[PDB]
Enzyme design. Structure first.
Site, PDB file in Angstrom:
ATOM      1  N   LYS A  59       0.817  -1.226   0.000  1.00 22.82           N
ATOM      2  CA  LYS A  59       0.000   0.000   0.000  1.00 22.82           C
ATOM      3  C   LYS A  59       0.852   1.280   0.000  1.00 22.82           C
ATOM      4  O   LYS A  59       2.062   1.217   0.210  1.00 22.82           O
ATOM      5  CB  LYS A  59      -0.954  -0.041   1.185  1.00 22.82           C
ATOM      6  CG  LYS A  59      -1.828  -1.272   1.188  1.00 22.82           C
ATOM      7  CD  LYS A  59      -2.781  -1.304   2.331  1.00 22.82           C
ATOM      8  CE  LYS A  59      -3.651  -2.522   2.230  1.00 22.82           C
ATOM      9  NZ  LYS A  59      -4.450  -2.759   3.446  1.00 22.82           N
TER      10      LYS A  59
ATOM     11  N   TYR B 155     -11.968  -5.058  -3.598  1.00 27.50           N
ATOM     12  CA  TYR B 155     -12.600  -4.842  -2.294  1.00 27.50           C
ATOM     13  C   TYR B 155     -14.139  -4.981  -2.325  1.00 27.50           C
ATOM     14  O   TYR B 155     -14.846  -4.445  -1.456  1.00 27.50           O
ATOM     15  CB  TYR B 155     -12.169  -3.475  -1.752  1.00 27.50           C
ATOM     16  CG  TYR B 155     -10.707  -3.414  -1.343  1.00 27.50           C
ATOM     17  CD1 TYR B 155     -10.209  -4.246  -0.336  1.00 27.50           C
ATOM     18  CD2 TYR B 155      -9.828  -2.516  -1.944  1.00 27.50           C
ATOM     19  CE1 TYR B 155      -8.873  -4.189   0.056  1.00 27.50           C
ATOM     20  CE2 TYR B 155      -8.493  -2.451  -1.562  1.00 27.50           C
ATOM     21  CZ  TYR B 155      -8.023  -3.288  -0.560  1.00 27.50           C
ATOM     22  OH  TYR B 155      -6.704  -3.228  -0.177  1.00 27.50           O
TER      23      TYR B 155
ATOM     24  N   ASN C  80      -2.286   0.220   7.263  1.00 28.45           N
ATOM     25  CA  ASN C  80      -1.585  -1.023   7.557  1.00 28.45           C
ATOM     26  C   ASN C  80      -0.630  -1.507   6.446  1.00 28.45           C
ATOM     27  O   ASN C  80      -0.398  -2.701   6.296  1.00 28.45           O
ATOM     28  CB  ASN C  80      -2.580  -2.105   8.021  1.00 28.45           C
ATOM     29  CG  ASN C  80      -3.489  -2.636   6.900  1.00 28.45           C
ATOM     30  OD1 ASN C  80      -3.609  -2.057   5.829  1.00 28.45           O
ATOM     31  ND2 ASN C  80      -4.139  -3.750   7.178  1.00 28.45           N
TER      32      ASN C  80
ATOM     33  N   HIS D 261      -1.105  -5.252   1.634  1.00 31.95           N
ATOM     34  CA  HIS D 261      -2.199  -6.200   1.373  1.00 31.95           C
ATOM     35  C   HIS D 261      -1.673  -7.592   1.008  1.00 31.95           C
ATOM     36  O   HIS D 261      -0.733  -7.724   0.229  1.00 31.95           O
ATOM     37  CB  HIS D 261      -3.114  -5.699   0.248  1.00 31.95           C
ATOM     38  CG  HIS D 261      -4.028  -6.758  -0.290  1.00 31.95           C
ATOM     39  ND1 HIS D 261      -5.100  -7.249   0.425  1.00 31.95           N
ATOM     40  CD2 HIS D 261      -4.004  -7.446  -1.457  1.00 31.95           C
ATOM     41  CE1 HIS D 261      -5.711  -8.178  -0.289  1.00 31.95           C
ATOM     42  NE2 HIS D 261      -5.061  -8.324  -1.429  1.00 31.95           N
TER      43      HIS D 261
ATOM     44  N   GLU E 148      -7.491 -12.114  -7.452  1.00 31.03           N
ATOM     45  CA  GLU E 148      -6.633 -10.932  -7.290  1.00 31.03           C
ATOM     46  C   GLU E 148      -5.490 -10.903  -8.303  1.00 31.03           C
ATOM     47  O   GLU E 148      -5.285  -9.895  -8.973  1.00 31.03           O
ATOM     48  CB  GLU E 148      -6.087 -10.841  -5.856  1.00 31.03           C
ATOM     49  CG  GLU E 148      -7.107 -10.302  -4.836  1.00 31.03           C
ATOM     50  CD  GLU E 148      -6.626 -10.393  -3.398  1.00 31.03           C
ATOM     51  OE1 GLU E 148      -5.395 -10.370  -3.174  1.00 31.03           O
ATOM     52  OE2 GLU E 148      -7.477 -10.480  -2.484  1.00 31.03           O
TER      53      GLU E 148
HETATM   54  N1  LIG Z   1     -11.917  -1.032  10.647  1.00 25.36           N
HETATM   55  C1  LIG Z   1     -11.241  -0.562   9.579  1.00 25.36           C
HETATM   56  N2  LIG Z   1     -11.046   0.758   9.373  1.00 25.36           N
HETATM   57  C2  LIG Z   1     -10.367   1.242   8.313  1.00 25.36           C
HETATM   58  N3  LIG Z   1      -9.842   0.445   7.370  1.00 25.36           N
HETATM   59  C3  LIG Z   1      -9.978  -0.909   7.462  1.00 25.36           C
HETATM   60  C4  LIG Z   1     -10.698  -1.508   8.594  1.00 25.36           C
HETATM   61  N4  LIG Z   1     -10.678  -2.846   8.436  1.00 25.36           N
HETATM   62  C5  LIG Z   1      -9.993  -3.089   7.287  1.00 25.36           C
HETATM   63  N5  LIG Z   1      -9.583  -1.935   6.719  1.00 25.36           N
HETATM   64  C6  LIG Z   1      -8.812  -1.764   5.470  1.00 25.36           C
HETATM   65  O1  LIG Z   1      -9.398  -2.582   4.460  1.00 25.36           O
HETATM   66  C7  LIG Z   1      -8.439  -3.521   3.971  1.00 25.36           C
HETATM   67  C8  LIG Z   1      -9.125  -4.849   3.727  1.00 25.36           C
HETATM   68  O2  LIG Z   1      -9.844  -5.270   4.877  1.00 25.36           O
HETATM   69  P1  LIG Z   1      -9.877  -6.846   5.173  1.00 25.36           P
HETATM   70  O3  LIG Z   1      -9.987  -7.508   3.817  1.00 25.36           O
HETATM   71  O4  LIG Z   1     -10.835  -7.189   6.285  1.00 25.36           O
HETATM   72  O5  LIG Z   1      -8.414  -7.095   5.809  1.00 25.36           O
HETATM   73  P2  LIG Z   1      -7.139  -7.791   5.101  1.00 25.36           P
HETATM   74  O6  LIG Z   1      -6.484  -6.711   4.264  1.00 25.36           O
HETATM   75  O7  LIG Z   1      -6.363  -8.250   6.312  1.00 25.36           O
HETATM   76  O8  LIG Z   1      -7.686  -8.934   4.274  1.00 25.36           O
HETATM   77  C9  LIG Z   1      -7.318  -3.598   5.006  1.00 25.36           C
HETATM   78  O9  LIG Z   1      -6.048  -3.921   4.412  1.00 25.36           O
HETATM   79  C10 LIG Z   1      -7.365  -2.217   5.653  1.00 25.36           C
HETATM   80  O10 LIG Z   1      -6.478  -1.275   5.024  1.00 25.36           O
END
Ligand SMILES: Nc1ncnc2c1ncn2[C@@H]1O[C@H](COP(=O)(O)OP(=O)(O)O)[C@@H](O)[C@H]1O
Ligand SMILES: Nc1ncnc2c1ncn2[C@@H]1O[C@H](COP(=O)(O)OP(=O)(O)O)[C@@H](O)[C@H]1O
Ligand SMILES: Nc1ncnc2c1ncn2[C@@H]1O[C@H](COP(=O)(O)OP(=O)(O)O)[C@@H](O)[C@H]1O
Ligand SMILES: Nc1ncnc2c1ncn2[C@@H]1O[C@H](COP(=O)(O)OP(=O)(O)O)[C@@H](O)[C@H]1O
Ligand SMILES: Nc1ncnc2c1ncn2[C@@H]1O[C@H](COP(=O)(O)OP(=O)(O)O)[C@@H](O)[C@H]1O
Ligand SMILES: Nc1ncnc2c1ncn2[C@@H]1O[C@H](COP(=O)(O)OP(=O)(O)O)[C@@H](O)[C@H]1O
Lengths: 151, 151, 151, 151, 151, 151
Positions: C11, C51, C114, C117, C128
């Protein structure tokens, strides 16, 4: 052994880019003893008195500004030829002329954002140390490894 | 963002074993903001107050003496949940229970020589910061990567 | 052996905070194969299908905006369980629940910033993989170390 | 202090992939004392006698083969709970189950190419040490840092 | 400041020997901007125009074969003197004349397996840049640290 | 390729200051092949013969005593021009004259505590290898990356 001290300051660009610990690591791993360590926003007065022998130059104004523009890590390191060796570890003033392996060589680019300062002489050292540190902030102790660092 | 702060001290074993840089580097690379940094020999009075919640413990006098036996690096670090996740970074109190990847897991062995202290709560943290630092020693600045560390 | 694939994206905070080289390094030294590697300024359209399973969620809108707000390093890594184990290497979605040792646990703080991805599944990975990469762009070769990486 | 010893062997995959120094570094930085260090192509007999309590299994044949197929670094490390802690540093037998931060977690993938072995008990340790090392190859000395590692 | 560009390619030994993450890291931490980044299985035709100034040389034939013999990591780096200083960072063409600290001096041995290509000039860089990359693939953005990297 | 070998010893200060892993890691990452490795306390007889070309030097007796004062890590490393470029990696004899990026430049301060020895010639190297190792202690294997390190 040897109790020669030098003054090393990490400039705000060095702080802002997260290079503090890496710089300290380089001095520790070399075997130099940490004597003083403080973190401060350095005053215009201090930076003017510090960089005073360079008042005549067309970068002094912007220099003092930048050095006041963020926090600096002020350090004192002790060891055999620290001043001279420390400056080699640092690299040449201009990061374009600093060799890979050096602090400037590895981590920065342009002379006005050259991340770090270190004393250019034992003369400079003691002046800079008295100017940035109070006596009581210089800590005395013996490395557990002293006999393996020094004959 | 978050302006929550924690107190982190590098114990004399940490300083003696050349871990200052390493430890600072982990807090930096995590995105946390260095707020205060000082190198000092802690007085027994200071230490006794620092550790006042432990005055009734078998190890207390030993802890104080050991903590007085060499210089410590006193720091203040800022960020979202710094106190709690600062402790996660440190490992468990006992380095045997700390996992690889944590500061204690990676760098030390015995509980009485566990190289680092971190505040155990926000309340403790602020008590500890007020005890080790004067508010004017704490430097305010904004990280250039703030918007990239915090939504 | 195994020539399974996963999508890992760094990211724009990751890229901005200079964690590109370090993240790759951690996959390499684990002994996974760099299949494909592109540095793309991603699109909102592109991000939405990725997403889609989160379109129902409050944060979705801003995620896409954040994900869209700067360059990404788009990469494919080949190896045995590169999907699953790569997610252990990423740590939890929330950096505050991510263990030290993991990429998030070491390098970031807030759930919404974070840095990286990874693919939740091989199901998701193939979905993906094809969206960011065309088969032309994916590379095929044998690791000179393959025999020592897998029996 | 404590004179508990463990036997750590770097397997040929670990040697072949250039992980020797990194592995040794992890033990040094932790504070464990290096007692023995040799580099050897280990005989079938030795590896059979070593992995003997696992003769009944459907990977034993291929195991001894692989362990004989290249050079191994044989080591003895000393310190408080080395055996137990060393195994934690190593990670779980299967690198898919080894946590990031661990040796297996960070550097390998598949259980048959899991780069490293370490004793699972103080029992195993002394057997393995007598079997891989001659008494005179175990070196005795005191770390300069002993008083900073141990109470 | 400066938004000058250079072509840096990590040759297939570089990729095979897992030096991708480390090499990027060294450009990042220097504070250069990742402009473009592609993992390409290069072509002989592509290689010849690149190496046209060496068609006169004995080794040319095999170079192209070696350069062609496995995947390359193709990259563009933006920064002040990224061309020139990047070549200091590469070290000499011959790894045996490359200083420790440089990429070749640290990571390789033989002139014909020197892990990395850089641009001999900006002249060469622009020529080189366009051949491996189309303008679509190159990314444009501002480093959150730019102000601290350049005055 | 090349089957040229050199003798490298980590002096007792190197071992005491926890540099074994670091040093081995630099030789590995350079592409050199570890041929022999042993941990031992060197006898004065051995050391006196090791350093026989220096029997007429003011520092000789001190050197021998210091070299006998703790354990050394004796190694044999193979590769094209290992002797000459092994010495380049070490730095100059005096760590003050060794450049950042070299083992001595980075890790030590004083000539009498210069942490490491390397053979100064092919002739010296073979004399030294024959003196410290039995030929059966030297392990023959082929690096899996050989074709990637050598044309
Ligand atoms: N509560 C939240 N608030 C803001 N951004 C979020 C939150 N949960 C997830 N995200 C963002 O959305 C992305 C995708 O969410 P998710 O698919 O649940 O997690 P992952 O990336 O671990 O698979 C994450 O990488 C993160 O940047
Ligand atoms: N031409 C220049 N432009 C901008 N800043 C400069 C220039 N020359 C020197 N400086 C800055 O002034 C500081 C002091 O300069 P000088 O004493 O010449 O170098 P050093 O800091 O290496 O001793 C340097 O650290 C550098 O950041
Ligand atoms: N059983 C013990 N023996 C010796 N020292 C101890 C012991 N327990 C704790 N200590 C020391 O006292 C410090 C404070 O103890 P405590 O507050 O319980 O742990 P923490 O440091 O995790 O907050 C520890 O960091 C450690 O150095
Ligand atoms: N299913 C398997 N397939 C291949 N190799 C295995 C398997 N299980 C164990 N091994 C190998 O045998 C060695 C000894 O096994 P074990 O004693 O169970 O694990 P450890 O080595 O962690 O003590 C391990 O290091 C591993 O490399
Ligand atoms: N004497 C040689 N033998 C084999 N290969 C060589 C030789 N000289 C150069 N090469 C190869 O050709 C490439 C280009 O050569 P040249 O352009 O002179 O060096 P550079 O890559 O430093 O610009 C090098 O990266 C190297 O891989
Ligand atoms: N002037 C000196 N004082 C103390 N020790 C020395 C001195 N010169 C050399 N030595 C020690 O003797 C070793 C061998 O010396 P020499 O062969 O001249 O250097 P090198 O180690 O570079 O081959 C050195 O590595 C160093 O530890």
């Amino acid at each position: 052994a040897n109790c020669e001290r030098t003054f090393i300051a990490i400039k705000p660009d060095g702080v802002q880019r997260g290079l503090v610990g890496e710089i300290i690591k380089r001095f520790e791993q070399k075997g130099f003893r940490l004597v003083g360590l403080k973190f401060m926003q350095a005053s215009e007065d201090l930076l003017k008195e510090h960089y005073v022998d360079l008042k005549d130059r067309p970068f002094f104004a912007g220099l003092v500004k930048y050095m006041h523009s963020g926090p600096v890590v002020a350090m004192v390191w002790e060891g055999l030829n620290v001043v001279k060796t420390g400056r080699v570890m640092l690299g040449e003033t201009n990061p374009a002329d600093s060799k890979p392996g050096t602090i400037r060589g590895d981590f920065c680019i342009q002379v006005g954002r050259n991340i770090i300062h270190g004393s250019d002489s034992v003369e400079s050292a003691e002046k800079e140390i008295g100017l940035w540190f109070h006596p009581e902030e210089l800590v005395d102790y013996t490395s557990c490894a002293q006999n393996w660092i020094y004959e």
